[model samples]
Target: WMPAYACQRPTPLTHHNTGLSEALEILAEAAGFEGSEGRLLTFCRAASVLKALPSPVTTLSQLQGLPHFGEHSSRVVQELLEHGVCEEVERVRRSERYQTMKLFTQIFGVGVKTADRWYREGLRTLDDLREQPQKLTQQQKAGLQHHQDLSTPVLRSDVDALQQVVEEAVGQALPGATVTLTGGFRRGKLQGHDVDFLITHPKEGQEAGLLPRVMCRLQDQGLILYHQHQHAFERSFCIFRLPQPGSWKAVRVDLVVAPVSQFPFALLGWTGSKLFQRELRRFSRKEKGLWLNSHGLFDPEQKTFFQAASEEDIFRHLGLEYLPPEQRNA
Candidate 1:
């Protein structure tokens, strides 16, 4: 039996239907480019269901009764299965809008809205952007400058030394503060666009000012090339000058500091495949009548928040079977 909501199932990073799922996800990405959030969600849900399945869908009938396999998504799968290609997906793949949107959004600080605006402005390439410096933000400038390094994937091998440096910085900031790796790496990805870390001190409240102290230590070590502190959850999005043999390479890193009491929630939120986390929030609100975020899970009716010491406890509180980080890749 399949679960209607993605959060109810385990989605490993590797799956049997890679080709088929990719076809659907292309449509999802195209939908996102067009600002059709609802359609984007529909295609992503369909792709996720395929990723979570244990075996390949060899026949059209095999998709019967599968959640999120709406008519559009199923037709795409059918075409790929029979003819080795889907016309609609191929069209999107070759479209200028899709390609340009993808390129613009890959820049660290750009998002859908900004990319769309730039696309409509006839800004086709990085050179075009250089001509309109007036339109750019400081963050966008930094992103463009480091675009070459940021485009390269962060390999599994790269995380170890980076993690050590982060931990040492944490130790310098506060003796007992700890850094836990999160994001795609924690979800079993071999390579990712950036690195993510969540920091916390065992003693509650000690982590309140931890991010600033950690930033100073990294800056003192000449590791931080550029850093921006986001107000929420005391987080920093940074570009680190990672040490190589003769010099260094720019690496994107995200750091979040949580009080011990809320560490579990922050961990769960940050260690995610974007779709998986989105599904969990939907499930929590609709199925459980609860409000869930990185900081806490709240019960609106009771006007209280739930307490959890671990991610397993949070899953149990929501009545879900606990799926560890490795299986959260939807």
Candidate 2:
């Protein structure tokens, strides 16, 4: 078997296998759109296994005994290995339902279910969505208005500028507050769809109320174009106005606040290739009988939580070897 948990394997950003993995990921996306989540996950898991390979897979024999590569997925892989592409995958890629569902789900606020519902209702384009004003939530409205800008990739330079802006606001709101870059950028990606920041203070209780205060400061500075607040752990999803030489661009930024005690866990959770974190939690609950989330690691058996001063500690507590953020793109 390849590996029971994705966390048990090292998946670097520059993996050797992509030809086979891309085909499977396309199938996975199509399966997800059709509401076949179990099928989708199966495809995704197989793709993740390929991405973790030490070398490119060129033969069907190379895939023998892999943990997630089942018969159906194996057949798909074999077709790609021999024919250079899978015809069924191409057919799904060209299907109208696949295309429409893909477009709808690209919106920041739209999930697969909402996208599917809209597809059934004959909402084919952004224009169709605009016509149905009452159907959109406030978040969806904002997502539509800034679709193009939000979809644009944020460069490392853009992240740096946004970081400065956030740092200034956080400093003004609380003198000792700290802001850290998370997500793919933290994992050394030069570009991403959005930027993520984690904020906290050195003192245990000083981070309370920091998010709103920092948000207010940014809003007063005319830097916030649109914002949605999720009060749990004081999170804010914002469209920021990044000033250039003459014009400004709308950049998506996520701000989350945590107490100093929980900051390590929060940082580790936010700095993830979503699948890596999911598998990490899966390993935690299945193997260790502990619940792992952005908050902290909890032992349901003991009715107590584990304290982690760093991400390494969290990994150790879960009985996992510490894989740095760069190696977590499972």
Candidate 3:
């Protein structure tokens, strides 16, 4: 039986329903652009169901018992099955607001609200925003400056090279510090929008003040182009100067520091396909009566937080089969 929660099943990196899922994901992103979180989650859940399917859905009937495929999602699939492309997907792709919002949101610091504000102001192109530079934040300015490099995909080879450099800096900054790569790349992705790394010291407290030391190392070596802190955890969202053939390329890098106690939870949270993690939290709270987050899992009824030494341990605690990082690509 197919489970409603994505965490309860194995979802491989590659799936049979590429076109179908892509069409649904477009609607999900469009919903997000409209600030409709509920609609976005619905479309995302429907798309994840497609990704987890063992066979490509070729007929509308194939979706009858599928989880999260309500009438609207089903209609899109039915349209694609009949015409080889969903009409609504095509319509949204060609719509002006969709394209403009997509372009504006791709900038580093711009979110949907920021992009929406710019769109309401009649801003259409990057050039239009550039003409009125005062509206741009410092982060947005860097994003525009490195727009070309940021748009390029980060390859697996690039990940290896960057990891080596990062590890070297970590070794110098705090010996015995561990660097674990997470995010899409950890889920067997060949390329990603950016690389995510989690740093922690086995002794726990040694990780304190880790980001500043790491940033100084990166900056002193002329590797850092720009960097700023992020909360929720000690994180530095940075642009690095990656060595290229004739010059260097700017690449986005996320450095997160967590104590040893929270490493497993942080690792699980960071090594995710967004929808997969979203579903995991939903399942934890709704089905298991547990509160899940990047820091740890809490049980409000017991007023205690579950301590996990490994990802497998957390999964076991949730009574979910331990799906590896790769299979979590919902």
Candidate 4:
């Protein structure tokens, strides 16, 4: 449930991670520090696990079994057993840097690097950012234009609204095209930052032409802001902004199209951080003699597709359990 706060940005999706209560106790007991430091340690430790725990850890015992915790950490465990929450966590509530970082990073266009640059340039507060006249990238400008709205967490209802827009577009250009929202939302999350779409048509060749036609229609309806297409051999790769009609603020959106035959692998790939996806591909290629891409499975041994119908199947082919999106933070 803990999101990696590497740069200070808070994701629109808030996580109600349960095991963090126990993890905090482990950290507090393992380290000797003041209340604030102890609380910060809890953050540090929780972030570590959130960033690397195995996918779909459904129990606290599963969390405790992770190697990061040691004997003194067990003492923290005892403390947690006695008290409902860690003492140090309560103390860090007054931290200025942590709080400010959280605020600065919420802009959709801003990443850790952008946040760091702003913080170092004396942009300590939103007020400071507003007062300073500075150069901004196009993405950052979009972030600024919609800063207030983007800062407002994206609810499941908002995701549904966005999905309706997408479904309408799909209906007009490519009837019967299947569109699924993959990512944290698909994994049963309550909210998400921007929307992600994985679309497919029953016929492999038919799906190849879907994204461009759909994008053009979307542009005609004035629903698109920044649109670009990238395609290699019929697969659709596109990035665009979905602007509300007559509104200056447009949200970031990614749209990918694949033949229905390849939908499973595409879903898993799109549902995660690029790093995790890459690592998975590397694992397959280096160890198992297979090539992985959003298009489909490439088996060197068979010289054919190891076609999959579900995410679990792909991971099975790769010799690992299917990881939920949260665990894919790696």
Candidate 5:
């Protein structure tokens, strides 16, 4: 995700939310779109009040009584906190139109427009479209091709094995390069659909040619079933099959290579739920005049890069509290 910096902007006042901090997280996932940090914060706030708070926040006063809340949003949170659910969320939840759009939008290849069109045509469930198979797109075709494998969770053991393979590949291709596992694996999630790794050469600029070399080696070894290279921007997502019977089913994998200077920033960008990264970018741009990415950070104020040595440093440099991998769900 790219940072939303429009120009140099003033940092918004931020406060600590002791009461709703935990509850808002669950609400975010239930609502989806945890791709942006601001949205995640909103989700975190709303969900924390609902899921984490010990007591019901019944009145507006009760909400105001909590810390780190703004005036307008507090009213919305109070409604949910008191009533056991937010009217807006419930409204969206109950809306036939909204539900339909959400359902269709989740299809493997369809985006919002395509899903909306199908929704208008009364297509709701996955099976409903079997009669209208022409509606599927190539991306959706790929999505359905390994629907079972794609939908199934990749266990931690599988992640470890992939990591070993990646490490070996890096060792053989770029002797001094280091590979760090990112995403849910870094945050300690038990299962995910894919494994993400960030490779970096300890020296500057040397990492430039590493990805192609490593990728080619993996392919030569028959370890890679599908691979794509993206260079100018240092990002690519690929799928690989396990060396087992069901191995023909490709489990997706993403590998990113950057210079050591960019490693920490890239790690943060890669160690994400996608939504959390988006939210962080949004908050940085709208609330604080800054641009952030997987390859270090840019501060409009100083007109310079804020090099991060670690993910914790990235959060600290951003002026927000750190959310360890588990809490990053927001």
Candidate 6:
């Protein structure tokens, strides 16, 4: 029997569903490119189901009664199974509108909504964006300026060096602070779109104002190319200067601070595949009638927050088996 919600499924880092999942996910991205979030989510859920499958789906019968695999998704799967490719997905890949929208959305601050608007306005190239500089936000300008560098894959070695720099900064700002790498890298991905770090101290209130101090140290060292500070527990969206042979390259980095009590929850929440986190939160509220967030897991019925010292505790409290971070690729 298969689980109805992806949070209940064990989606290992390595799976037998790559082919099918890729096709469905392409369709999902296509839908998102057109600004159809509902349609996008439908395809994404179908893809997530395939990603969690224990065996390769060689026949349409295997998909029977699977949650999220509606008639259209089933048809796509069936076509891929019989013909080795889905025609609609191929068409989406070759379409001019889809191609342009995908390119536009890859810019850091530009989302599908903005990408679709630009596509409708006939902005087909990055050069087109450059020509309309007046229309771009400051973040978009920085994104476009360093697009090539930011789009470059962040290698494991690169992550290590960046981590060292962050470690030094945090150590200087707050002794005994801990910095843990999260995101795709933490999930064993050798290459990631960006690097994410979670910082916390052993004591409850010690982490307060830590991010600002660390950010100041980084700024003084000329490592911060761009930064946006947000919220109370302190999060910084930044472009960090990553050193190379003769020069430096800008790399996207996210820094988040949490009090010791909330560290595990924040770590679990930040180490994500996006869909996995969404499904986990969905299951938490819809299936269990409890609230789950980065800060902590709460039970409305009990009117108290669940104290989880580790990710396993969170899953145990949710009544689900713990899927390790590497297996949470859904």
TM-score for each prediction?
A: 0.97, 0.96, 0.98, 0.63, 0.68, 0.93
User: Top model by lDDT, which number?
Assistant: 3
For model 5, how does the per-residue alpha-carbon lDDT over 1-330 read when each residue is reduced to its tens digit?
111221112111122443444334434434443234456455554433333234455566655444335554565567656676666656656777666665555545556667767776888776777666687765566555556676668888778878988899889887888999888878677888688898888889878778888888778877775666777347556667666555455677889887787787777778775656766787777677888876657887788988677777877777776666665543
**Candidate 3: stretches off by over 4 Å:** none
Candidates in descending TM-score order: 3, 1, 2, 6, 5, 4
How badly does each model clash, as a count of residue pairs? 0, 0, 0, 1, 18, 0
List, residue by residue over 1-330, the lDDT tens digit for candidate 6: 778877887777878889888998899998877668899899999988888787899999999768898998899999999999888999999999988988998898898889888888989999999999997988899899889999899899989999999999999998999999999989888898899999999988988888999999999999988888997457898889988899998999999998889998999999997899999999999988999999999888889999889999999999999888888888
Candidate 5 regions with alpha-carbon error over 4 angstroms? 1-44, 48-64, 67-114, 117-138, 220-226, 243-249, 273-288, 316-327
268: Cα error in model 4, Å: 0.7
Tens-digit lDDT string for candidate 4 (267-286): 87777654457557767887
Off by over 4 Å in 6: none
lDDT of 4: 0.61
Q: lDDT of each structure?
A: 0.91, 0.90, 0.92, 0.61, 0.65, 0.90
Q: Candidate 1 local accuracy as lDDT?
A: 0.91
Q: Which digits, one per residue and each the tens of the lDDT, describe model 2 over residues 12-79?
A: 88887888888999999999898898998889889999998888998989987789889989999889
Instruction: Compose the digit string of candidate 1's lDDT tens values, residues 1-330.
Output: 999888889899898999998989899999999999999999999999999888999999999889888899999999999999999999999999999999999998899999999999899898788789998988788888899999998888778879999999999888988999999999889999999999999988888778888899999999998999986588899999998889778899999888889999999999987888998998999999999999999999999999999999999999999999999998
> Lowest-lDDT window of 10 residues in candidate 3?
58-67
Residue 122, candidate 2: Cα error in Å is 1.3
**Using alpha carbons, what is the TM-score of model 2?**
0.96
Which regions in candidate 2 have their CA more than 4 angstroms from the true location? none
* Cα shift from native, residue 21, model 2 (Å): 1.5
